[PDB]
Amino acid sequence: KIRIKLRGFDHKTLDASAQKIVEAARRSGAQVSGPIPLPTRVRRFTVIRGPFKHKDSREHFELRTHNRLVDIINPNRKTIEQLMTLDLPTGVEIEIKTV
Amino acid sequence: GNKIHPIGFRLGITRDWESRWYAGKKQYRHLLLEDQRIRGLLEKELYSAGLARVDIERAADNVAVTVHVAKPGVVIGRGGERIRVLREELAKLTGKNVALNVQEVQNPNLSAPLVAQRVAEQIERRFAVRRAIKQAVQRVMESGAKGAKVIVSGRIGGAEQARTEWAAQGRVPLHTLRANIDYGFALARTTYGVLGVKAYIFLGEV
Amino acid sequence: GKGDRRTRRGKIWRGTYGKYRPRK
Amino acid sequence: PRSLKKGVFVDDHLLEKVLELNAKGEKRLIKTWSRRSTIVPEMVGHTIAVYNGKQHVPVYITENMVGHKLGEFAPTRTYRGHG
Amino acid sequence: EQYYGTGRRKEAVARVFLRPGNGKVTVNGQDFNEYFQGLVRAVAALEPLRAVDALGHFDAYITVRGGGKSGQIDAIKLGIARALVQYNPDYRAKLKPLGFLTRDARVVERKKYGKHKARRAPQYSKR
Amino acid sequence: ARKALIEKAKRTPKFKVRAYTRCVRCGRARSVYRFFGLCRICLRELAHKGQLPGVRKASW
RNA sequence: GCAUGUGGUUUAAUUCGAAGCAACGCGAAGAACCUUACCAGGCCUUGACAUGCUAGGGAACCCGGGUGAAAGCCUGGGGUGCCCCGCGAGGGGAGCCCUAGCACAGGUGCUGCAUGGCCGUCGUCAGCUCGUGCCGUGAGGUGUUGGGUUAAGUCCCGCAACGAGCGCAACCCCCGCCGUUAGUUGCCAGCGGUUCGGCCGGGCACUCUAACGGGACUGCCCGCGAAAGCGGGAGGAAGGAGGGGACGACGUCUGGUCAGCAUGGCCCUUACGGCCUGGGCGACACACGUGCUACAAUGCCCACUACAAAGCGAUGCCACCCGGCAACGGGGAGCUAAUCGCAAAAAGGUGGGCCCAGUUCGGAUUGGGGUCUGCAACCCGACCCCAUGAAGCCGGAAUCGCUAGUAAUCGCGGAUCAG
Ligand SMILES: C[NH+](C)c1cc(NC(=O)CNC(C)(C)C)c(O)c2c1C[C@H]1C[C@H]3[C@H]([NH+](C)C)C(O)=C(C(N)=O)C(=O)[C@@]3(O)C(O)=C1C2=O
Ligand SMILES: [Mg+2]
Ligand SMILES: [Mg+2]
Ligand SMILES: [Mg+2]
Ligand SMILES: [Mg+2]
Ligand SMILES: [Mg+2]
Ligand SMILES: [Mg+2]
Ligand SMILES: [Mg+2]
Ligand SMILES: [Mg+2]
Ligand SMILES: [Mg+2]
Ligand SMILES: [Mg+2]
Ligand SMILES: [Mg+2]
Ligand SMILES: [Mg+2]
Ligand SMILES: [Mg+2]
């Protein structure tokens, strides 16, 4: 029924964040298809270590978009409020779908 | 110029980012631009308070500016008088929900950037170059750190011949990832010029 | 050719499409 | 070259000095800094000074120098040799 | 009845199904040749089968995705390989010191910075 | 960074073609990532303090 | 031959710096104006920018004309909020606005040989040192050396040494096997239906998908050896560090840049500072440095036919539809992106055309015709179609790279950025 999409930066909070959520959609009246690991995306930046001329010496950075997605089957009115009284991870961005 | 920055190594290995958000392609560009104003004003002023590590966690247009600092009552004033002057001067720059806290630097020798500063100060202060750096380190294995090291690095003492100096002690092992070490870049200013300074401290293997 | 424009691979090389490289 | 789906191109301030001195059956030397513009058949027989860096250059406009832009008749640099 | 093996090699993955019967091979629907045409390493994929006497003993249902047909054929082969220990955990004796049970741990190394293609560097006269 | 030349790129221009970015942090528009509004010198310099979230140091 | 830097010349200027390897497709991960420091013109003077001071007027502000290459300047009008006092006209105030003056702003002016920082490098080479002691009157030595071993100062044995600090190494990531949690937008082995398309029911088996763990230790065996180690094998997905990455010790070259930024100092501040349109970094008797495509039969070409990984995209990616030989234009469905799209992978495969030719090789340089981005393609762009079809039949002396999924060869992608 109601689907969530977590898009963050860690692999830590993003797993933590989504496993607090995964407990109060079991106790509160819902069967659930578990925590879902998704097609992470990488944006990398290759850059000249040097101020000036020394080109062929280069540094490497990767910004890792981490995608999580959990499905709630049978969403109660014992539920929906239990997950707006669970909200607490800091670097995460949550979103809420429903078809 | 051969080696690498210690912090920027343990990026989520034995350290952590100061600004800890999320962001889209639209937002990250502007959103961050903001933090570098937040951290330009915040710094420029708070100097003689001894400011250390500046967190800026973020939710839906709620900024969360924490602040570690040597001396929490030069951030404060008397009562709660001067902290308010700023707490809005930031929402004056953001245009939103500045939650500007305070957190004391408990032990001050056991946090690098401070250590760096007081020395870079002491150089601005026209002190004994060597002894500055010796006692610098001294206090660090006196407060109880695993390793110490300070790198004075200018035209030193007023000389026309640019050199460099230093000393240290204990474990300094920056090739062990699993060793937590804090870097302190300072940057004294004296009549003859500008004399960057460094300071590394080991606390422990994890 | 490959530096040749009016051909099979020579388009592909440039990246382009033309009468000599279709869109199916 | 220039899209036909979007017709020819000329700068306004320059065309202004042309079809006012056309509409008064006179001819004078014009001084403008556009080169970026396409000469048109309603300028033929005009004395037009175009600029290269420092100098306004003598370019009296005849017939079959039609659709070519202005800057083709006003060399930009100086090359005679190396010694 | 079906015996299955896990076949993998160099950014290409292959799935094997061993039923008792003929020696027809369907790889993504198509016959063994209508997918591995004028290509010679082709018929080599079956090697791990013929060192125990069974080409004509079993059928072959196949699926592959990724890599090129060589890197698939190595995986196909490594699939018929693994597949035979699920039938005979005694065939293991015959096809290891014969070498057919191993992930070719070989891999297209990373392109490096400063080096045209990882290992290759730039030419320079006037040294 | 000629001071006034951060400003010839701050304000909006005569025509939209002249829209070249620059660094917020130093004013070198020579190699700038329109995702950081920053250049390569900066991006490291900063990334080396962890002041850009999620910006890890890469390796594979 | 063309592409790109560079030397030298030329130039109103062709702005700067890089200098044997370790400058030369390097600062430029995007010079038509912009960038832009350069040159020629038209200009601005508390200045495009800061925190202000004093005198006098002004709410801020917003609309139009004139002259003009644009800037710039002369000028018409709309507007008269906020704070305090007051019944009131209206004075005082904060902001900001203009004129004059002053603080001063600003400079990609100089010096990298006055610095910061960061980079290159000898060099991922196995080295560099200190403590206490020992030994010399001492500088100093010993340790670290010798023999064995190691990718190593790795380690074993010896020694007047014993240990530690910075290096080696491990802890981090990638790839290789496998297990735990997981079944969407991915997946289809069995069963049901099937518009034959994993299309639908159903399932999450396996592939994949990211997070955490397991596993390799000279452990086992014969041999060699005081030992460390070494050689061959058994098991294992992996064997002696399994492959790859990040990771650069005390120091040197007064190596690099005041041109990202930072700053001592010398230097201008109605001018090097500032704004502007145009011109220039692309000029061309040459020379080097880097690469692209060739000179072709293991090939060129036209069809039909398969198999990828990685990344980007709601100010964009653009399935199809129509027009055009085509670039592309018009219309328009989907996609915050495992769901939609760039997307054609290409060498390979099937089938056929060429038959040693300056050639159906080769694809320069030209003539003309168009499309697109853009205020604007003459300097000075890319792409389409037609016609032009140059040099070159594998390259002097010299010289470069690579030890395995490497070298070669073939395609895809991203950053920068309208193009
Ligand atoms: C010419 N000499 C007298 C010189 C002078 C100065 N500086 C001064 O004279 C400035 N003195 C003041 C303080 C202004 C009075 C100098 O500053 C220098 C040099 C030497 C150069 C040599 C350079 C050389 N190459 C690249 C041209 C070179 O091969 C090396 C090298 N060792 O590889 C260099 O070191 C060199 O680049 C260099 O650094 C020099 C100077 O710095
Ligand atoms: Mg041809
Ligand atoms: Mg390859
Ligand atoms: Mg190179
Ligand atoms: Mg400056
Ligand atoms: Mg631009
Ligand atoms: Mg200079
Ligand atoms: Mg220009
Ligand atoms: Mg130097
Ligand atoms: Mg120099
Ligand atoms: Mg020098
Ligand atoms: Mg080594
Ligand atoms: Mg003695
Ligand atoms: Mg010993």
Ligand SMILES: [Mg+2]
């Ligand atoms: Mg030694």
Ligand SMILES: [Mg+2]
């Ligand atoms: Mg000795």
Ligand SMILES: [Mg+2]
């Ligand atoms: Mg050791």
Ligand SMILES: [Mg+2]
């Ligand atoms: Mg389903």
Ligand SMILES: [Mg+2]
């Ligand atoms: Mg069926």
Ligand SMILES: [Mg+2]
């Ligand atoms: Mg290491």
Ligand SMILES: [Mg+2]
């Ligand atoms: Mg040199």
Ligand SMILES: [Mg+2]
């Ligand atoms: Mg250039």
Ligand SMILES: [Mg+2]
């Ligand atoms: Mg059509």
Ligand SMILES: [Mg+2]
């Ligand atoms: Mg179209």
Ligand SMILES: [Mg+2]
């Ligand atoms: Mg021939």
Ligand SMILES: [Mg+2]
């Ligand atoms: Mg080798």
Ligand SMILES: [Mg+2]
């Ligand atoms: Mg490409």
Ligand SMILES: [Zn+2]
């Ligand atoms: Zn920058």
